[PDB]
Design a binder for these strands. Structure first.
Ligand SMILES: Cc1cn([C@H]2CC[C@@H](COP(=O)(O)OP(=O)(O)OP(=O)(O)O)O2)c(=O)[nH]c1=O
Ligand SMILES: [Mg+2]
Length: 330
DNA sequence: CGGCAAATACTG
DNA sequence: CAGTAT
DNA sequence: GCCG
């Protein structure tokens, strides 16, 4: 399935252009449609060669096929030459951290057209300014090698003040990709408690040696802190700034946090959607049953948290065959 | 046609 | 609450 | 966008 080579790269390459286009424009679902088809093509055991062949792949309809036939026969899609040249800018703006569809739309509607304009005439949030300062660096993905060296840093720094702590790099890393956009580290402790309030001793230790360089999201006042979104950079010459993502969780939620943080996103939403049909609910906390809702139908009480010691148990209960991380791209 | 790829955590 | 982010 |  997934872990195979894209036999239809030339096809998806272009469709991918539309997907992103419709996305920034706000057409969420239409873009979602393409996304699905694209993934379908990617995982196809062989390369598509005919119009009919495309129509046989679930997720591909006439319209989509019509575009496939054009590319397979002319090597070029016409729809691409007719995209508001306003999209490039939007795509450019939304690529800023903390900047999304709305924000990117706002700036454009205000005259801005280049990162130079925004870099001097736009109203930026502490987050956005950081995303802009490291714009070029956040565009590049890192080698599984570098990613690994980052996890180790966070881990050794954690086990530095408690060897019991367990650190695991999830996300694209755990799915075994060759490159990672960022490093998603999950931290917990077997004694189901030694994890409580440790961000301070961790974040400080990182800042101390200079590892961490920026902070995007981190409520360091409260002790109920859960996630951390910042920027780091390993020692040495020619080092780029990488996006870090760390979360601390109770050893009693490990199985559900690992599933979540491992993703992928599409995979999560999909799986979570399924649970919703079995009268359950999935999250990084646990897999529960239907919540208590009074006459009105208002959630008045939590559902019964089912026992999920490992990931496998989550699937079993959901009535699905366990899928390796690598096979969870979508 | 309308639903579809969710549940949750931070920031003004 | 709206927007952005996992 | 595709699908029930
Ligand atoms: C954005 C997002 C993410 N997730 C989960 C599931 C994956 C992890 C890691 O996220 P990331 O985007 O780094 O993904 P990753 O797969 O690591 O890819 P990169 O290499 O970082 O791009 O977070 C989710 O459930 N819903 C979302 O909307
Ligand atoms: Mg990641």
């Amino acid at each position: 399935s997934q872990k195979a080579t894209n036999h239809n790269l030339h096809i998806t390459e272009k469709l991918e252009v539309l997907a992103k286009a419709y996305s920034v424009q706000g057409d969420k679902w239409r873009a979602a449609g393409y996304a699905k088809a694209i993934n379908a093509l990617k995982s196809f055991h062989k390369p598509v060669t005919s119009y009919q062949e495309a129509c046989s792949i679930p997720g591909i309809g006439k319209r989509m096929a019509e575009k496939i036939i054009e590319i397979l026969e002319s090597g070029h899609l016409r729809k691409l030459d007719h995209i508001s040249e306003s999209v490039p800018v939007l795509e450019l703006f939304s690529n800023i951290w903390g900047a999304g569809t709305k924000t990117a739309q706002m700036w454009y509607q205000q005259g801005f057209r280049s990162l130079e304009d925004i870099r001097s005439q736009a109203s930026l949030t502490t987050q956005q300014a950081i995303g802009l300062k490291h714009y070029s660096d956040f565009l590049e993905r890192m080698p599984r090698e570098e990613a690994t060296e980052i996890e180790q840093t966070v881990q050794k720094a954690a086990q530095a003040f408690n060897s019991g702590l367990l650190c695991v790099a999830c996300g694209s890393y755990r799915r075994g990709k060759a490159t990672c956009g960022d490093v998603d580290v999950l931290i917990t402790h077997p004694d189901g408690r030694s994890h409580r309030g440790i961000f301070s001793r961790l974040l400080d230790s990182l800042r101390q040696e200079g590892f961490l360089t920026d902070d995007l999201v981190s409520q360091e006042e409260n002790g109920q802190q859960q996630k951390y979104l910042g920027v780091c950079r390993l020692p040495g010459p020619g080092r780029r700034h990488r996006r870090l993502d760390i979360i601390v969780v109770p050893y009693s939620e490990f199985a559900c946090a690992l599933l979540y943080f491992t993703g992928s996103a599409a995979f999560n939403a999909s799986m979570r959607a399924l649970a919703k049909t079995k009268g359950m609910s999935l999250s990084e906390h646990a897999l529960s049953t239907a919540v208590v809702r009074n006459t009105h139908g208002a959630k008045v009480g939590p559902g019964r948290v089912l026992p999920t010691p490992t990931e496998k148990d989550v699937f079993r209960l959901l009535g699905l065959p366990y899928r390796e991380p690598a096979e969870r791209d979508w």
